[PDB]
Amino acid sequence: VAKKLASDYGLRCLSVGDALRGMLNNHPDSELSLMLNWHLHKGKTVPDELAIQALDISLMESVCNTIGVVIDGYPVTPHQMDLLEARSIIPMVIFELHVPSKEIFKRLLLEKKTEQSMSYPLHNSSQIIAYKNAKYHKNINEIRQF
Amino acid sequence: EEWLPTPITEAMMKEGLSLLCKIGSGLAHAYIKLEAKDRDLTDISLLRSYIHLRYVDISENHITDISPLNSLTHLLWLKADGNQLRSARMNELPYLQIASFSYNQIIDTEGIFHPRLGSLDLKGNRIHQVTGLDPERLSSLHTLELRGNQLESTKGIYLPKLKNLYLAQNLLKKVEGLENLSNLTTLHLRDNQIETLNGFSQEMKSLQYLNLRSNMISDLAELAKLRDLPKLRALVLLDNPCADETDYRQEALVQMAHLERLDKEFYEDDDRAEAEEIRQRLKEEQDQD
């Protein structure tokens, strides 16, 4: 859906990784890039402040800044929701997708067909996927409430 | 043998660690590749700090053990060919989709158990025999490559999950026993030695293609036997003694019309129209019974 929106009226959508990756090219030795590397080598996977900065930096991006951006599945924790509000990264509107596990698994079986459409190895564990989805429920309930 | 101790440091991680992706929790993000193929490496103790990879190559190194990786099964693939390892004695990995350990010091099949590996390669290893090969717990293992290996008994390779196996150039004075592995789809005995069947039948029903290059085969009566396979459509007998037989490829086309390919060579399809007459001749011989 995010991609469909982005295409259909040239809108943006962002994952956190999108910004971080962009930063890597835009200057591999920027402050944020240096911190990112340092943390990565410490195994510190994305201390949230880094993503928060990268995201508001992405708001600079003229298309989004003037026109439109959407964010997918983020924040993933209430703590991120709080710190985003602290900067006041604040969507005008939010939408939520309620789905039976059966549907998710059927879609995943079609993704299994796509894996033959693909060729290079990829992470496909329905077991992990289920775990992640359950924790998505866990955090999203609180995030929605707030 | 002569090497300096070669653990690793931040500097190597800064070069190697690459491809940024959102971790097994689906929350934060991590770099997913490591690359230290050949740096005379020996130790992985720093690598433990980066459990989140999916991909590594560290082949052609002096690494003797990786057992800390047993903590890190979220990896999808590892190559560590040429390294100093002796068997796959890891935990039964829930995610290592593929690996290879060819040219290693590996001897056997210990620890080969992983539910979520599909393909493995082990050519040029010192492997001699089956040492445990679980038919079920290897629940995804579809492919194994073993060219040149020092191999021995090939019964007990009882792994229905496997599609195809490649013991080409392996030192097998004889091979044995495949009939129950219905999912068996291809074997190479390319450059092997053997002269007669060893427990093979149509019950390997998925088996579409077999290579027997340089094997001892001579008696085309074998063409009566594994003809029974429902889906075998290709063979190789190249450089076998049967290549001296006056029909050989011709007779093989008679014995199996859907033998589409032989000896690096797709068949003369109009010689199938010939071999249909020759099959009539055979039936006129055979239906005298």
Swiss-Prot record, chain A:
Effect of deleting the gene: Mice lacking Ak9 do not display developmental abnormalities and exhibit normal spermatogenesis with normal sperm counts and architecture. However, spermatozoa progressive motility is markedly reduced.
Cell compartment(s), UniProt: Cytoplasm; Nucleus; Cell projection, Cilium, Flagellum
Region (NMP 3): 15-46
Residue numbers binding AMP 3: 21, 73-76, 80
Chain segments carrying region Adenylate kinase 3: 1-146
LID 3, as annotated region: 110-124
Known tissue expression: Highly expressed in the testis.
Function summary: Broad-specificity nucleoside phosphate kinase involved in cellular nucleotide homeostasis by catalyzing nucleoside-phosphate interconversions. Similar to other adenylate kinases, preferentially catalyzes the phosphorylation of the nucleoside monophosphate AMP with ATP as phosphate donor to produce ADP. In vitro, can also catalyze the phosphorylation of CMP, dAMP and dCMP and use GTP as an alternate phosphate donor.
Record family assignment: Belongs to the adenylate kinase family.
Listed name of the protein: Adenylate kinase 9
Organism the protein comes from: Mus musculus
First-to-last residue of the parent protein present: 1410 to 1555 of 1894
UniProtKB/Swiss-Prot annotation, chain B:
UniProt keyword Hydrolase present: no
LRR repeat intervals: 52-73, 74-97, 140-160, 161-182, 183-204, 206-227
Domain LRRCT, chain residue ranges per copy: 240-278
Recorded coiled-coil stretches: 268-289
Claim: Repeat is one of the keywords in the record: yes
SMART domains in UniProt: LRR_SD22, LRR_TYP
The protein's assembly and partners: Component of the axonemal radial spoke complex. Interacts with RSPH3A and RSPH3B. Interacts with RSPH9.
Protein name, per record: Leucine-rich repeat-containing protein 23
Native source organism of the sequence: Mus musculus
Classification of source organism: Eukaryota, Metazoa, Chordata, Craniata, Vertebrata
Encoding gene per record: Lrrc23
